[PDB]
Write an enzyme that holds these catalytic residues in place. Structure first.
Site, PDB file in Angstrom:
ATOM      1  CG  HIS A 113     -70.146 113.358  53.858  1.00  0.00           C
ATOM      2  ND1 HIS A 113     -68.936 113.553  54.491  1.00  0.00           N
ATOM      3  CD2 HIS A 113     -69.883 112.588  52.774  1.00  0.00           C
ATOM      4  CE1 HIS A 113     -67.984 112.929  53.814  1.00  0.00           C
ATOM      5  NE2 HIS A 113     -68.535 112.315  52.783  1.00  0.00           N
ATOM      6  CD  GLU A 114     -72.511 110.927  50.379  1.00  0.00           C
ATOM      7  OE1 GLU A 114     -71.900 110.277  51.251  1.00  0.00           O
ATOM      8  OE2 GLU A 114     -72.049 111.130  49.234  1.00  0.00           O
ATOM      9  CG  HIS A 117     -68.827 114.081  48.340  1.00  0.00           C
ATOM     10  ND1 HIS A 117     -67.503 114.444  48.463  1.00  0.00           N
ATOM     11  CD2 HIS A 117     -69.010 113.040  49.191  1.00  0.00           C
ATOM     12  CE1 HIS A 117     -66.920 113.665  49.362  1.00  0.00           C
ATOM     13  NE2 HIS A 117     -67.812 112.802  49.814  1.00  0.00           N
ATOM     14  CG  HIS A 123     -63.671 112.630  51.930  1.00  0.00           C
ATOM     15  ND1 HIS A 123     -63.456 111.389  51.373  1.00  0.00           N
ATOM     16  CD2 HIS A 123     -65.013 112.747  52.077  1.00  0.00           C
ATOM     17  CE1 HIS A 123     -64.616 110.775  51.210  1.00  0.00           C
ATOM     18  NE2 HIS A 123     -65.579 111.582  51.623  1.00  0.00           N
TER      19      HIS A 123
HETATM   20 ZN   LIG Z   1     -67.574 111.340  51.276  1.00  0.00          ZN
END
Ligand SMILES: [Zn+2]
Ligand SMILES: [Ca+2]
Ligand SMILES: [Ca+2]
Ligand SMILES: [Ca+2]
Ligand SMILES: [Zn+2]
Length: 158
Positions: A113-114, A117, A123
């Site tokens: 997830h990170e 980013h 998101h």
């Molecule tokens: Zn996030």
């Protein structure tokens, strides 16, 4: 939004959580990068000195940016989008208990997830997407990006 404009990307693990074996931290992070290199032209390499594009840090509370951590629970980690300096960096809250499995908070899943980013994704509103903003354990050995995640990243790369 910002994207990396080169294909060879470096990362460095600044420090290691005492929650896990060192080799397991290395492997979880490596596997998380592979998830994204699988679906883009990006290549990721770990370096042990100097300035990497993506610095991976474990820290607690206030730790030198505007995204102070908040103790166990709540915010688990955060990352900066592509750019110089702190751009790309991924920070993990040491007040969580990081693991290789379904106990605590799974490092690999959180890192996927990170890193999303760090590569410029935001998101997703889709609960099945890894870029959905609530952690949920899913079997890490059979993990696959959602169609939504693949569409998201392929809008930026490849
Ligand atoms: Zn996030
Ligand atoms: Ca950086
Ligand atoms: Ca927290
Ligand atoms: Ca911890
Ligand atoms: Zn931070």
């Amino acid at each position: 939004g910002p994207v990396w404009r080169k294909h060879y990307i470096t990362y460095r693990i600044n420090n290691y959580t005492p929650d896990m074996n060192r080799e397991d931290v290395d492997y979880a992070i490596r596997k998380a990068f592979q998830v994204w290199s699988n679906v883009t032209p990006l290549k990721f390499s770990k370096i042990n000195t100097g300035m990497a594009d993506i610095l991976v840090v474990f820290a607690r509370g206030a730790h030198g940016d505007d995204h102070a951590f908040d103790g166990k629970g709540g915010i688990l980690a955060h990352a900066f989008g592509p750019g110089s300096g702190i751009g790309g960096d991924a920070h993990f809250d040491e007040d969580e208990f990081w693991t290789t499995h379904s106990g605590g908070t799974n490092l690999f899943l959180t890192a996927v997830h990170e890193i999303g980013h760090s590569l410029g994704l935001g998101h997703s509103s889709d609960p099945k997407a890894v870029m959905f903003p609530t952690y949920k354990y899913v079997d890490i050995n059979t993990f696959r990006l959602s169609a939504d995640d693949i569409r998201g990243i392929q809008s930026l790369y490849g």
